[PDB]
Design a protein around this ligand. Sequence first.
Ligand SMILES: Cc1ncc(C[n+]2csc(CCOP(=O)(O)OP(=O)(O)O)c2C)c(N)n1
Ligand SMILES: Cc1ncc(C[n+]2csc(CCOP(=O)(O)OP(=O)(O)O)c2C)c(N)n1
Ligand SMILES: [Mg+2]
Ligand SMILES: [Mg+2]
Lengths: 658, 658
Amino acid sequence: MSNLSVNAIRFLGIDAINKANSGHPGVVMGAAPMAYSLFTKQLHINPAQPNWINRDRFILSAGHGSMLLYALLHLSGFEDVSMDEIKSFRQWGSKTPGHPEFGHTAGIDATTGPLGQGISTATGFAQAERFLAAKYNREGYNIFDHYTYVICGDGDLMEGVSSEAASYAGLQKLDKLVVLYDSNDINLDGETKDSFTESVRDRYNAYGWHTALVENGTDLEAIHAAIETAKASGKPSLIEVKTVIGYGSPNKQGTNAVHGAPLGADETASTRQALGWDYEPFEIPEQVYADFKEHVADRGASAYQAWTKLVADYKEAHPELAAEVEAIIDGRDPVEVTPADFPALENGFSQATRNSSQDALNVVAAKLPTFLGGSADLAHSNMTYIKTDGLQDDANRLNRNIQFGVREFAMGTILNGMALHGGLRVYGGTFFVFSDYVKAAVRLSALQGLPVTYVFTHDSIAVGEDGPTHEPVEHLAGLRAMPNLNVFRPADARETQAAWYLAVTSEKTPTALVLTRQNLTVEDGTDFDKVAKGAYVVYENAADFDTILIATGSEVNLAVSAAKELASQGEKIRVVSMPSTDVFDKQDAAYKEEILPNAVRRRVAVEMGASQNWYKYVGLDGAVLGIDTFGASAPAPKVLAEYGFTVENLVKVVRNLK
Amino acid sequence: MSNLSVNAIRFLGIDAINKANSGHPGVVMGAAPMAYSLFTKQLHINPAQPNWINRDRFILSAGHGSMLLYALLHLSGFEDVSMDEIKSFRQWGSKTPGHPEFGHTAGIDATTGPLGQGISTATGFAQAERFLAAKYNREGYNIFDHYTYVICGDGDLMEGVSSEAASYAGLQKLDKLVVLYDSNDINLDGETKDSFTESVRDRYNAYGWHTALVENGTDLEAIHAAIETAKASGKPSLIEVKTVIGYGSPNKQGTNAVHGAPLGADETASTRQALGWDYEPFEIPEQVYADFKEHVADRGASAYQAWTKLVADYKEAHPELAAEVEAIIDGRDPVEVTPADFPALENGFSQATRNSSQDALNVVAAKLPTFLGGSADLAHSNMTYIKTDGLQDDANRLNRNIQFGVREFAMGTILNGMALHGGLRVYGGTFFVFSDYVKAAVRLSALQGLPVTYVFTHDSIAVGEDGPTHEPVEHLAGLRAMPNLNVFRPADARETQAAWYLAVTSEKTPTALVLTRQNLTVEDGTDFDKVAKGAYVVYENAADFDTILIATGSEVNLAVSAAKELASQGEKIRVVSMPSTDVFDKQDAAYKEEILPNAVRRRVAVEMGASQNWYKYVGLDGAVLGIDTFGASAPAPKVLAEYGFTVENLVKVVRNLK
Ligand SMILES: Cc1ncc(C[n+]2csc(CCOP(=O)(O)OP(=O)(O)O)c2C)c(N)n1
Ligand SMILES: Cc1ncc(C[n+]2csc(CCOP(=O)(O)OP(=O)(O)O)c2C)c(N)n1
Ligand SMILES: [Mg+2]
Ligand SMILES: [Mg+2]
């Protein structure tokens, strides 16, 4: 049934796209042979156990060909993809959305669609398998041992993020990563002669990868032999496969006219005739089902039974490892972090919060053996090192510090890949101003529900001499507006302890930590336990106050000092600290009225950044002291004075509000 | 002497860094020889005419080495860089800030610092020179004829954006671009053996560039021979030059200890002794000044005078071209576009604003011959094509459509380069959700004062079937908070003509245009001339109204329909269309009170995106109908209803306000 099975894939895609009147047929018709060869000869997957921790992983980086993956899962027997769901492709509430989504459809390993990020994120899947294998395997017990596979297209290899990833992966020697490249000479606006003329395989040779060419994209035995050679090469692999987009369409194959529109009735009838397919829409003969059940489902189910018997014997042979590995198979952390792990700090202690962050992340690393991370060539200024280890690489696989090089975007995608695999907790650092370079991978953290921790230091004009290209202004507003992201800006060393404890116990929300270069003073009124509420009171001189100051981070020290001045003139005032706007917004309506009462409308907000998001708390009769221009090159005390952040100026702002 | 002059560059940098107690000496000491060779043998520049339009252009991509460029401009005789300004490195108000700034200091061609963007933006400098040479040069009169040169480091070639640009430039065959790569085997956290082991020159061959190697980085004759070869090769060039970082420091050279901290007093005394330099800080001998006066200053003035005579002869031989070239040398556009160029539109006309956008920009291209643009493999969906032309390349240099491929970040830097050169007006398009991929280049557009126009289509959940990875939510709030960026979201075709007219007449502010997939209706009350105020009234049934609706884009149609329904039941209501929050915030205080009177506090805002920025206008006693979750994969009419964007739900929201 090989030709028969291959065409069953093609026509399930074509007919499903015609009925939704929406979708992408070209890639399904071109890539069906190489995907059939991969599912029937390489992958070990079990449709009765779709989340098996030691299954082979697969990522469709060219996410617009989603109907190719849906057809393969239906024919193999996955429960969530019935024929009724194939007939509901791209409709409200279905299991078959227009681009693949993780956690919504059982059997799908990663959310794709944004070009470049699929092939990049697969690097982290492969690295996560290497660490777990080095920590836990023993002689005769290969508990963690599997491959990572991907299919990509022309668009993926034009995007810069995938060049970053391939350079890093060649240095790291990740020999279990295997990529199939659909090379059909067409993209959305036309032919690659006007867009993409480089030699792709010569470039990948310079990174230290294995490369090869398959001239006839419909030859099943040539495709299998190349994959076998790639797995024996000792290097990450890129196999270029020449295909015809829209293969079988007499009037439109080889043209961009089949890239992203349904074929329609007249061309669909001409395509059936040319390929010899006389079955009606959604009619698949029994021969094809029996082919997929022998070579995918039964093969995958046999490998799963042998793995479970292996794990049972492993727990008997090594009782000192049994507890941790059992937890990981349950989907839990091997060890539990608690508030009692962090020492108490004294009022008046003076420390910059980048240094407070290093102290707290070293407490976590000593307690939890599956916590790891790195930086983008800024470890010596972010202060991200775990001080008991060196650098991780092919010759030192258990170390927990990673050097990413100057590659912020790919760093985001690799963390996502390590979090998707299962078993680990991860983090990564850079300067706050260059969060623009990684913003699109932060969105995929928020979309897939991954608790990844981003470490952004050097947060304001207090940077000083480096100047406007190195000084953040607009960046907090941009991040606070993104759904399912929690942004923390702690006020001293004590608030920094709490934010790390929340970041490392989060269930399905990523965290961004915003930290200072200059020293800050531990306040008498801050409190570890109250940070989990998002905002709380740190100063108040009279229970009948009529004035409220709101502040975050390094501006909390400034606002408390101004309140004591105003109090000595006879005012009645309260100071609120708000380390997270996103967490405060989720609290109960009773708690919000206790912190910001409706009857007190005299309000002033303070923060060294754009004014935009503070009007939802101060309203039309309040004021905001922020920054709405670019920065300046000079020592930091002078720049702060020229921009209005002094105690004197804040006192003036409050007295002129009435 | 050469050796005497080369050490003058090094110690000027060393001493100025010690006096500020801040800066980066390593790259100055390593790269002084190649920088000296370029200035004395290759560059044609005139210190008395710093903005000469046919000068050779130079970009310092490794921006942390700014003292290397300030020393060179000082010895060459540029007026803004005196010895007093050298003694003011990194101090408030000086002409020598910590990273180079275009516009602030005369003789600086481009702002650098964020790694990768310097070498990338130089691509657009060279493309601008090519287009103006084809259009205006005639036999015997080569008015536009000059090269583009850059110095870069290891960090620049790890960033993804430089791979995108080099691939694009190899296809385009920009043979007058010349790059010197300072290869010192060191980065910020340590040695390149742990970060960057690829074969750089083998990768650049795969793109179609010419490459060469200089093993002894202090041999000035080997350096010169390599650049002459490169300029005759007929391809964009990359020359790898091996240097020792911190050359001369007996205890610190070749380590990351000299990357980013001053040498200090002890090691400076040891370095003066090691290189035989017997002059006190800021003491430069006369022979060095005369070496620079002869070989850069006098040589460039001679080339300038010859160019002025050639232009005068050219304008006598071709009087039909004289007026357009005269305007360009003056820094003005060669033709003026006015409001009477756009045709009037009928109330009720139905058209999507991506299509209105194609009509308006073709009006512009027919009037102004130096207006050009492109798209990142989305021309057939953004609707960006100028319909009288094909694609621009090495064989067809006068066409005005550009295919950038799937390369959003690099697109942004090439636009900035083309606008930095002078003479042109440029634009470029992608989907609004992938503005995340190009955000860091938009920031350089605003920081440098460049009127570059970005075209973002498919702007909300109205995308429908493609799903949440393709549906913008948080993107408007991120862009409106950036200083010096005007964001327009037009309500219909009439409002779209006006936005394009303002975008193309902006003097020093970039523009972002946000446009729809689906059709909208021209309103009775929209008005071409009032768009320049940012917000104005489009519906009002009674002069004593007590309610105000505020809306943008596709939500203006909805708001006017809900308003008419409320009127029929006896209410008195005003509707405000606000195509640009950023321009409205700049109006006179009297005009703000006219549009949003302080005494009317019942206010509802309507927009399909994040709610964050609308509280500045509605306060604590109004409401906002927006979106603060991710989108969904289904037909658009179904998604809009599920999210509450219907006439019936909006009426209800107004009535429940009290
Ligand atoms: C980052 C990003 N930019 C743009 C797009 C829009 N887009 C989707 S597919 C595509 C064409 C890419 O062509 P190719 O990968 O060669 O696919 P083929 O038609 O050969 O299957 C484009 C521009 C996208 N999905 N992601
Ligand atoms: C996008 C970006 N990321 C990070 C930085 C911070 N940074 C500046 S220089 C540097 C190290 C790069 O070293 P290299 O370019 O080899 O220079 P060298 O030490 O040889 O002078 C880093 C990480 C930056 N300026 N821009
Ligand atoms: Mg293709
Ligand atoms: Mg270097």
